[PDB]
């Protein structure tokens, strides 16, 4: 059938990260103190 003869040639058909930033959540930094020496002073006076 010559009517459905198809010819095709070459053509030019030419058509991940994860991150979220919150603002802050710092813990108790510099965790050290004492309430004896000052108590000793104010109970030694």
């Amino acid at each position: 059938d010559w009517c459905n003869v198809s010819l095709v040639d070459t053509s030019v058909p030419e058509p991940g990260i994860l991150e979220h930033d919150p603002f802050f959540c710092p813990p108790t930094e510099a965790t050290a103190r004492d309430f004896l020496a000052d108590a000793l002073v104010t109970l030694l006076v």
């Binding site: 108790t28 000052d38 104010t42 006076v45």
Partner: protein, 48 residues
Amino acid sequence: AMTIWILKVMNFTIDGMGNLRITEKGLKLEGDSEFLQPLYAKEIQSRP
């Protein structure tokens, strides 16, 4: 001397117990609050 010790321990500034304030409803905390031991709760209903 004992009363000055109380004022030094609890830090009774001009405006109440430091940043902490006590009102009719309950505690109003004008400072951060990090607890060393586990806390408890009943509800947490943030305001609209």
